[PDB]
Design an enzyme around this catalytic site. Structure first.
Site, short mmCIF file in Angstrom:
data_model
loop_
_atom_site.label_atom_id
_atom_site.label_comp_id
_atom_site.label_asym_id
_atom_site.label_seq_id
_atom_site.Cartn_x
_atom_site.Cartn_y
_atom_site.Cartn_z
N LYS A 8 -0.79 -0.61 4.53
CA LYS A 8 -1.72 0.17 3.68
C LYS A 8 -2.92 -0.69 3.35
O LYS A 8 -2.86 -1.93 3.50
CB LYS A 8 -1.06 0.61 2.34
CG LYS A 8 -0.53 -0.52 1.44
CD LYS A 8 -1.62 -1.19 0.53
CE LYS A 8 -0.94 -2.15 -0.42
NZ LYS A 8 -1.95 -2.94 -1.21
N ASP A 125 5.53 -1.56 -3.54
CA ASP A 125 5.01 -0.30 -3.01
C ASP A 125 6.04 0.52 -2.23
O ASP A 125 5.66 1.38 -1.41
CB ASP A 125 3.78 -0.57 -2.15
CG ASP A 125 2.63 -1.15 -2.94
OD1 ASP A 125 2.33 -0.65 -4.03
OD2 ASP A 125 1.96 -2.10 -2.52
#
Length: 268
Positions: A8, A125
């Site tokens: 990401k 995350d």
């Protein structure tokens, strides 16, 4: 079973204020990027056999251990993790690895395990990567709302400049605090191929402390990349390309100064 664990980037990151709890309130966008670790996950009769960096401290190892516990020890697993994403650079490889292990074990050993509960236990995350799409985030980055992102060509660059992540946060000052990101206008700018109205408030302290980082950004701008930002707490950067050949050529040029990859950002 084979899995892919994508990276990401933080497509904008604004530090809103320091909270009553002493952490910084963020508003930030998480965008999947197509550079991905490869995992092979296979059931076996017994034991947890894991090959990858950091051994038992790897988040993916802990994911597997937590899952097998939650599932009533249904059998063993062998996991091989082949890293393509650099670690501790703002790219979330470890969290993505753990998400894929959770998802793989869910398929291999179905047992009504609550994956999101496990993911929140693991933290970082992992809950984000379970979504398989972009998200808009608040709190310390953990409060997620799904966000549809147009898939666009991009370049990620890694300069190899690691500092502990709390440092950049401790270095933040009230003068660095920003408003909310204009989410819709950022999405529009991506789809239209314009300069997005985003920023990363952490670039305030980071560029003051580490002026080398401004040179990284300038180099990427010079290759024609738009919206060049350090990704979250860094030190990886990304930029938006005019098209896939442009991304490939800009990544190739950047290899002189570090590691670079062309890919797609967003898509779900």
């Amino acid at each position: 079973m084979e899995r892919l664990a994508p990276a990401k980037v933080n497509l904008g990151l604004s530090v809103r204020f320091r909270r009553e709890d002493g952490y910084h309130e963020l508003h930030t966008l998480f965008a999947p990027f197509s550079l991905a670790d490869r995992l092979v996950v296979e059931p076996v009769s017994s034991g947890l056999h894991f090959q990858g960096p950091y051994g038992r401290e790897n988040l993916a190892y802990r994911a597997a251990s937590l899952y097998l516990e939650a599932a009533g020890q249904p059998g063993g697993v062998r996991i091989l993790l082949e890293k393509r994403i650099p670690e501790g650079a703002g790219l979330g490889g470890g969290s993505s690895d753990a998400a894929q292990v959770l998802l793989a074990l869910q398929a291999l050993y179905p047992a009504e395990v609550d994956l999101f509960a496990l993911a929140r236990t693991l933290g970082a995350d992992v809950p984000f990567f379970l979504l398989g799409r972009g998200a808009e985030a608040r709190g310390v980055g953990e409060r997620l709302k799904p966000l549809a992102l147009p898939p666009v060509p991009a370049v990620v660059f890694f300069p190899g400049l690691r500092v502990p992540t709390p440092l950049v946060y401790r270095a933040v000052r009230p003068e660095d605090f920003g408003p909310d990101l204009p989410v819709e206008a950022i999405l529009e700018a991506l789809a239209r191929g314009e300069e997005p109205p985003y920023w990363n408030s952490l670039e305030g302290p980071a560029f003051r402390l580490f002026p080398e980082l401004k040179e990284v950004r300038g180099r990427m701008r010079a290759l024609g990349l738009r919206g060049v930002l350090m990704s979250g707490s860094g030190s990886a950067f990304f930029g938006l390309a005019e098209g896939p050949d442009h991304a490939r050529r800009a990544a190739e040029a950047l290899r002189a100064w570090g590691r670079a990859w062309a890919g797609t950002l967003g898509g779900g």
